[PDB]
Design a protein around this ligand. Structure first.
Ligand SMILES: CN1CC/C=C/CCCCCC(=O)Cc2c(Cl)c(O)cc(O)c2C1=O
Ligand SMILES: CN1CC/C=C/CCCCCC(=O)Cc2c(Cl)c(O)cc(O)c2C1=O
Lengths: 214, 214
């Protein structure tokens, strides 16, 4: 169908505007936050499935998968977690006042390291360290597949998905990286960041690499 | 939208029924035929673009790409060639009497090697050596994206594509491999088949591999 446009709660636009703009040095921390969110969403579907085994059947495999698309300057982080409905994408990523947004900003003002972000529960927004644009594509067992999109501006759009591959269940973060951050398209780099910050992760982390034959 | 069902010209059903059923030994030849068709479609868009440069702009990169999806027992061969419109998918893959279908069958009766198939211009149908089902997904500059599907039966379906990733331009062959042929999901195997039969190919042949980190 057509897109629907929603306004960000005010503190979130302010937080995103901060992050997309500061010259902080340790930008690679965004990967840790996104893998951690992925692992959180897989924990949720697994716990859910204890009392409700059919919830896994839409995508039995539990994994996190990173797919550099160098030609489009895009990086994708996919999981087969619980996923989000339209209403969830709208509430959880935008319109509702995050608990810790404003607190995180106050901590940052006072010297805090940007890497604390995830302890304030707003780690998702670290992605604007390396992307100037994002699509969250998500399929919950309780809804169709939808695309949430934002460029750190004051509003985001949400659109029923008739353009991307079917996720059976879960979420893809599609990051449209900045020109100064194309290094995160590289295999060695990605591996190195994962080894340094996501050692204790219960799910396989897969890396999709494209190689010219012979 | 909904699917539309079309009947195969009679000789083609007969040819496909033959191929999907014989215990011939050298099944790996299907890859050669599909890479060759891919290379043919890329030649066409490149020649087209001589007198019409904007035709490339929808997908500037010229490549062939093979993507094993082991979990789904699927193998994809994609190119960024000229692609096919709905009307083309319908005519070229089904309803119109191929020139060489019946001749190829007569040659086979008399002892011919199945590998001759591509010299009769019906190489596309070799895919039923290793797949019991196929989707051709295709985007031409002159039409929307469509899915042609067949299981070697007497009829095929054609459906506007609201479920797969956008190809900018070109075609994906999605092969649903048989259980006795899952070897073609493996990297070493694919490389070996490509080295033995598609040495002289003007376009990069890319192989997408998924690897668990560390
Ligand atoms: C955490 N949940 C599962 C849904 C959980 C929602 C409550 C918390 C929402 C905060 C945003 C979030 O972590 C969404 C998400 C992100 Cl960001 C991600 O990178 C990967 C994911 O699988 C999800 C997700 O679907
Ligand atoms: C040859 N053309 C470009 C369209 C050419 C059509 C005339 C010949 C149709 C025969 C079937 C065919 O080769 C279609 C095709 C296949 Cl099978 C393929 O594996 C990859 C492709 O890019 C194409 C294709 O789009």
């Amino acid at each position: 169908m057509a897109s629907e446009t929603f306004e960000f709660q005010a503190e979130i636009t302010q937080l995103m505007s901060l992050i997309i703009n500061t010259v902080y040095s340790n930008k690679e921390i965004f990967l840790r936050e996104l893998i951690s969110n992925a692992s959180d969403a897989l924990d949720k579907i697994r716990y859910k499935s204890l009392s409700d085994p059919k919830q896994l059947e839409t995508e039995p495999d539990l994994f996190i998968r990173i797919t550099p698309k160098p030609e489009q300057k895009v990086l994708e982080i996919r999981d087969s977690g619980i996923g989000m409905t339209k209403a969830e994408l709208i509430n959880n990523l935008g319109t509702i006042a995050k608990s810790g947004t404003k607190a995180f900003m106050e901590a940052l003002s006072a010297g805090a390291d940007v890497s604390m972000i995830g302890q304030f529960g707003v780690g998702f927004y670290s992605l604007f360290l390396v992307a100037d644009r994002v699509q969250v594509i998500s399929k919950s067992n309780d809804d169709e597949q939808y695309i949430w999109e934002s460029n750190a501006g004051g509003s985001f759009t949400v659109t029923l998905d008739e353009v991307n591959e079917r996720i059976g269940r879960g979420t893809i973060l599609r990051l449209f990286l900045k020109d100064d951050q194309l290094e995160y398209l590289e295999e060695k780099r990605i591996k190195e960041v994962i080894k340094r910050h996501s050692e204790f992760v219960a799910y396989p982390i897969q890396l999709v690499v494209t190689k010219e034959v012979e």
